[PDB]
Amino acid sequence: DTFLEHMCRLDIDEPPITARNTGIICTIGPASRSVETLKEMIKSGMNVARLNFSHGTHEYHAETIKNVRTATESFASDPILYRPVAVALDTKGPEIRTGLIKGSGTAEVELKKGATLKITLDNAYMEKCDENILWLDYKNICKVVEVGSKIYVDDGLISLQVKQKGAFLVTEVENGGSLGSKKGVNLPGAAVDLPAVSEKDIQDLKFGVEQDVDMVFASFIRKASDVHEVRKVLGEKGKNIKIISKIENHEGVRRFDEILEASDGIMVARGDLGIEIPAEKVFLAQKMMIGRCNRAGKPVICATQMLESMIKKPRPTRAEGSDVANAVLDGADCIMLSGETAKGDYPLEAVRMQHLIAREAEAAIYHLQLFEELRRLAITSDPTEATAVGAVEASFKCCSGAIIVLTESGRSAHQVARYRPRAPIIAVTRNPQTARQAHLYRGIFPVLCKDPVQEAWAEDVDLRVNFAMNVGKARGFFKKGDVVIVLTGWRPSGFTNTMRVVPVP
Amino acid sequence: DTFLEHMCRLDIDEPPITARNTGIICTIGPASRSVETLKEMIKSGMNVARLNFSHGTHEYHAETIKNVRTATESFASDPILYRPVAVALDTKGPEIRTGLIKTAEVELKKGATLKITLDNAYMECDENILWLDYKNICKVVEVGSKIYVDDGLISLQVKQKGAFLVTEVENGGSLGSKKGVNLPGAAVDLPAVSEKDIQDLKFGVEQDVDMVFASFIRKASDVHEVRKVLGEKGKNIKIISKIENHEGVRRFDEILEASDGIMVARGDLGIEIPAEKVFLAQKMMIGRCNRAGKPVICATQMLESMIKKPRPTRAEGSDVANAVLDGADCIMLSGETAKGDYPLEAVRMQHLIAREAEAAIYHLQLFEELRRLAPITSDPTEATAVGAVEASFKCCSGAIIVLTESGRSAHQVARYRPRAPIIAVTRNPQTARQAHLYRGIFPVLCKDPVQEAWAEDVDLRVNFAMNVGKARGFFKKGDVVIVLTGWRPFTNTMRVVPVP
Amino acid sequence: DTFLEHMCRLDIDEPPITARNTGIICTIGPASRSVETLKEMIKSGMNVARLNFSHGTHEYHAETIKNVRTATESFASDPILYRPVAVALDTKGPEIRTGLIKGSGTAEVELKKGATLKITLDNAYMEKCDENILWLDYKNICKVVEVGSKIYVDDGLISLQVKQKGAFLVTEVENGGSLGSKKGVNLPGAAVDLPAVSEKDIQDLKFGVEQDVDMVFASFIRKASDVHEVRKVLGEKGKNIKIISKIENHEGVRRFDEILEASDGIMVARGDLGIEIPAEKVFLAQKMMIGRCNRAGKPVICATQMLESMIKKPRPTRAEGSDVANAVLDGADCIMLSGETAKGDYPLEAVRMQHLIAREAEAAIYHLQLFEELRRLAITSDPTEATAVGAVEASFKCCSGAIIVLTESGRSAHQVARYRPRAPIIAVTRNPQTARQAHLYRGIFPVLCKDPVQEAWAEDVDLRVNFAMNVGKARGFFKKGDVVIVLTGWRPSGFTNTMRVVPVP
Amino acid sequence: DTFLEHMCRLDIDEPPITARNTGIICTIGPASRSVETLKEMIKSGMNVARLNFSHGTHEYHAETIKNVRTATESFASDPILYRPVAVALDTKGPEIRTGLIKTAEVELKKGATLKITLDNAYMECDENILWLDYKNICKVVEVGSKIYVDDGLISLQVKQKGAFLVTEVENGGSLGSKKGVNLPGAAVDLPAVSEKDIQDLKFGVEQDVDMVFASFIRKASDVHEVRKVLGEKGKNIKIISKIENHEGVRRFDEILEASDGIMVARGDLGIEIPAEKVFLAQKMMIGRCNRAGKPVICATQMLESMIKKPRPTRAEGSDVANAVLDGADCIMLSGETAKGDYPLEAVRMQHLIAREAEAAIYHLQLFEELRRLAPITSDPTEATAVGAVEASFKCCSGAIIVLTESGRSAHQVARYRPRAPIIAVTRNPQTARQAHLYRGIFPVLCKDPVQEAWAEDVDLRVNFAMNVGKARGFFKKGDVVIVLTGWRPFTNTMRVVPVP
């Protein structure tokens, strides 16, 4: 009857439903890029493969994408159990990085508090960085930094303070540590002039169209003009690639609504965000963006350091278990793993842990309160909209095993997902890209029908409907005698305006 | 967002869109049994004709019934405009009445020694001796019991008991010919279904009434009796338990479950229980019937001053509006249409008030409460019906068109109280008439023959509803509507479509 | 947990609290003006005496006011049980009335549908009205009426239609009936030019100041300028007389907020209102005005035909019982009886019936939902405001027998009443006018302390506090061992900012 | 109005007014026991000092306690700025630990044959033989039981049982010197209060600790034991039941009622129950403690990465904020302050996050829920406290000033969660220290002598609170505050006053 009361009723012994609704995005790298590991990644719950273009070459990422597809297509030959896997390109963007440490002896020079460290832009030191001279790739740094400005290195773990300036920078180490090679540099409060879409970004995005990626995670989006530039580079033939704008700076937060209108989805990139803005404020930015994306019906991803300790450990910290649960409770459509699957020692346990936590968090959601709050914040005239709210309400009413949705664009399924049913949304599609991109929206279980299209539209409709029925049975979503809502089109669909309540045969 | 902010924004200059959804039940008597007047009352908004069997002969009511059907079928030429009219039987029940005065009245004043005797010699009654028809009245009540006569207006308290009753008048007044008696705080052993009740109930079965208003229902046992009396030939006649004594209120939950509907019979209830409490019982019963999805009627003295005057009082206008706001499926007129001088105006007044009160309901708050309190079931029709009402709100629908043979699908929609009218297409004439018990259901009777192709017969009946809604001003071409059908000859299918 | 659920829990066998919170205003007339009947009127529940100045003379109303005070002061000599009684002046206002029927033979000429009735303004027929010629006192009627306009007579029971005009009016009777003498005439939809404050009104209001009336019920207020004129005539020496603006025309509804800001309170005068505007719309106007008066903290009276059948019958109709209950449920501070106590055969039963119904309706109110809705619609900086909301919340928390309030203006008590506690508000005052006017606000039980003011402010405070304790005990509001909230002043009160929770000794 | 609209409006550029209300509990160890560092941790926001008695000697902890009190009383010169610091004893409890390796580690890999023996010859441990300290481990678990070692990181399943345990390694790893063992899905007969527990609990009584964190509380029986062990001399020491196994969660309601508070001890709980479920248990327990008005602590690994790094991870920042949003009275740091390289920064980080999360709470929604769920009682102090919190919201108060000797009045205010700080004026030094268990209570210790006139002594202590609030930036002269006092030497009086 109230949020506190429902929160008092939570029971660790009540088991969740079989379906896990939140998507899991795994950054692929050396720990996960083999075909055989990728097969186990999919079996453990991976829905999207993220490729970070801050590193690597096109030849290298081309191979990974080929291995990702090879592992994905091995589970074909059973369309009932086949799980679509999407491919995401994450851009480098206007990123600032140090150079390579001097390779003589060991790596990781030690930076000590109070020590002086000169920062240079002279490429003679580009591969000879040490505890005296440090090179970085931002060629205009000595025009957006002043005496007293603080420079952050390696995920903000190292802080520096500019003590002298020049057309170099003499700093003093404030927070000390071990300095590795090519580490990320953040300049909070400074107006970094780097472009939104660099020359490399153009190249990386065009390679994304040739590789038929399903979505782009665009880094450091500060405003809608940045999103439009990504959109233009993708141009036509990239027109269906979803753009997920990553919010990781203060301007991106302040201009979020502008960015959200231009974008197909949002990523809370808390790594960069928590250095650019004070780390105590990230939770406010996350919940605001997830809430705003929820009311707009647009996918939102929670990212960056969700299970960070599982790079080295087989079990997460209690904060990391809490973070994944709270992100699902916040309403995130997808959760992300970055170094935990790309480079760490326990990538499959990390994927498995996210699957377990998210399923338990989905059970803990007070569904009607969300549904009522989502209904209030939206009286439109779209029959497919009304059909979607009606299908969700009918699903609570009869405790539906699933809402089966027939769509080739995904829009019909996406509209159901906005209203957050408990029952899984089995989205039957013949479009493979739609099956892949459907993982961006919580609760959609994309199934790719490969049967040839029947002569009678009515016979083709129950074919795809029946296929959803065998899909749901085999995966444990429902059994015979249960009831499911089926959403189909008007006539040879258009408006998705035909809802039925069907017992499972 | 809150109820207070909703009242604060009620606007008298906002004209009510959305034609009237609450059914109007009109008691027929001498001032309205004319075919001509009955035709005008249908035009004014009558949906159900009530025949009070506390008075009159079987021959008299059967001729009223014949006139009702004559006036109703005079409009049958146009199925688009035809408004079905139901017929209701209101029983006598365990009524205690008084004797005939030596037609004129006598005057009893306070302190007077009024005596009550069951010896039927006195049946044909002075300010000294009063004959009652309840021969076991004694020992049912005792010292200073407070018996009431003539609508509670005349009060009396007992002084001495016997085999006969010696009483002292508490509240005086005039008349005393066949006037009713109430014994509050007493257990009248008189049974719910008397011989006149069984014979009258059998008369309704043969007269093909659509529903029965069973007076003085005290317990579920009394509903089951009425049902088995109506028998196999009267299975489909709906039984509305009238609640008009304290026992009926105390056992309401069991009476509701056994019944098809409830009437708040405020006339007797306001005597059997303190008058300052009728409002509590009325809102309690209407609320529970709303939660149960069963029809509830508010009745008795809603526009009482219009028996003699062409406009109602301010209290009467409030009472009709608040009954609708309470959640009543039907409002009722008894003497205002049976014996009054302005029966047409009373029907028109209830039409005007009910439509203003319907437009003042916070519909989406009421729907959400009924959605939130809806039990979880596996009936696809219930699931379809909740979804259809949710859909109708999100797309601000012009109507919900429901195809049904028994009415159950339309009733399930009406339980969740959509703002949009429910056009119920049926081939069953009784279903069309019975649909008037549920708020929002606008029944239309299809007389076109059953096409062999199932999908063609659906498309015929849906097209019929489209024509009805366009003709009645419910919606226009291009407006969005919801259509509820089956696909397996379960009403499990909802389509959100523009109007052709 | 919801309004429907609470409404399903209503129990006719749960008895209400002893205190009845809604005020009862009784119009005094021949049926009620004797001292002895007035004594029984007070004992039956009368809190305000309304004197209608549409009729009578000053000499006549002076006697009634004297008898009202005589009956009121007989219960003095016990300040514990003494009940203050307020006196209200109801103005004639811009009222239109027919003349006197020809006295030859019997009264009540019969007007028949289709008959012609000439309306004249020639005073030769002023006392010779019949079924052929009818006189009325609006001298400019034939400039605000046109052919086809409808004229209403005797509470709208008779309707006429102007068929010919002139510097007379030839009409045809539409709704027929018996025509009595000096009956009220309404002209809906016409711009009646009669002044808001006539010469008679000025006289009647000045007589009200000399008679020390507590409030004015101003008829036919259409706008704030009308209220200001009443305020000016009362002027100084009338400054503390509360003005209750009666809303009984369409303009008064349309300009209600303007009127409410200028007025000290509002009366829904449904008699005239239900003729001026369609009778099916009165309930909308009533609930809107009562709601708006509730959120503004200003008294609202429901009036006119609440128990109309009890003019002639000893028991009301079911609609009349419903009307009184629903008016209390709507939130009306006071309910009114007009002809039921002024001229009818059962004035004491009518007063008693209103007391019984209102007490049962007060029990049926879902108090927390009102309190929360009243809290949301109002964060001010007034400590006496905060103290009042805190006292009400504390009263629900401990099921207080009463909230004792020490005030000489009543404002402190009025602020408690706005938030609608269940517990009665025992307002201890030494001001007699405050004790009388306190009946305008639901839940305030004014008690007039006549003890001489003590030397020590602290000793005077518990004196008045203890007096409230003996008041509450004797009237059945609480007993020893119960708990009551007491509201007192800061220091020798100012801000009413001292709340206590006290066990009853 | 809704929660979604509230999140949608959260603004990172709105700076938090209203100083931090959630208490910070810091475990003291080698990296923080210095008087100098302890002085800086008080300045950084430490409110309670936790001494883990799973390690260390009585002499060691007593010197830590002495240093805590040395650093705390260094600020005693100014009673306006003095921040009382409490001392907490965390017991060992029924801990199963392992033997010392022949300090260095050994490497166990999957499939390996690790044997467990209770013969204490092996106590001083190879990749072949592992000695446990729980001599009755056998028959408490059986085939393939899944025993866990070293924070759950190393997993093992049994193969053969005996009087000794033969196991196959499931999850490998390094080390093995005095590392903890957990047996999920098992009923360790080991008792809640061991001999070391009773002796350590008696040491706290003599060391004048303010509270006890009782490890591995499984049932109300275990709380009552701790209380009677603490005895008459330890009546006022508050007992916080740590919930860290499945039985403690299943019997939470009975443990809560017997306890003065609850700690969510997530370290062990995340091993004893599946890790994906700790969030459910944490929000369940915090919610029930909030409803009961009893302190609840969130603990264990909140900023774990700051043992080695000067900034926390994004998951750690979320965890602290969501704990505050859950409704935790206190947040806790264990190894981050006991043995880490950045103990001051960890305390500072929890201060920053908690104050941001406090400013993000929909306070009036949370208060209304606690008001709505508040039981109806006749205690004037409860009634005063709800009224004072309602008053503080309506007038946007700068503080609620509560005079109290035992703390009960301030706790009753804190139960209803006002936004305004609660300044609790007390002459009882233990009450001031114990006040840190409840969110919002800012304790100030009065050392001025008791004036003979009662009203003068009140006016002294209220004036002291006014000076504290002005000095700490809580409010300024002219701001509105609420003061709660008694009049009969019951805190039954509320005055809404400007600040002098």
Ligand SMILES: O=C([O-])C(=O)[O-]
């Ligand atoms: O029988 C009835 O209708 C009544 O009592 O009102």
Ligand SMILES: O=C([O-])C(=O)[O-]
């Ligand atoms: O003991 C503890 O604090 C735990 O298990 O987290």
Ligand SMILES: [Mg+2]
């Ligand atoms: Mg990148």
Ligand SMILES: [Mg+2]
């Ligand atoms: Mg009856």
Ligand SMILES: [Mg+2]
């Ligand atoms: Mg008047």
Ligand SMILES: [Mg+2]
């Ligand atoms: Mg532990």
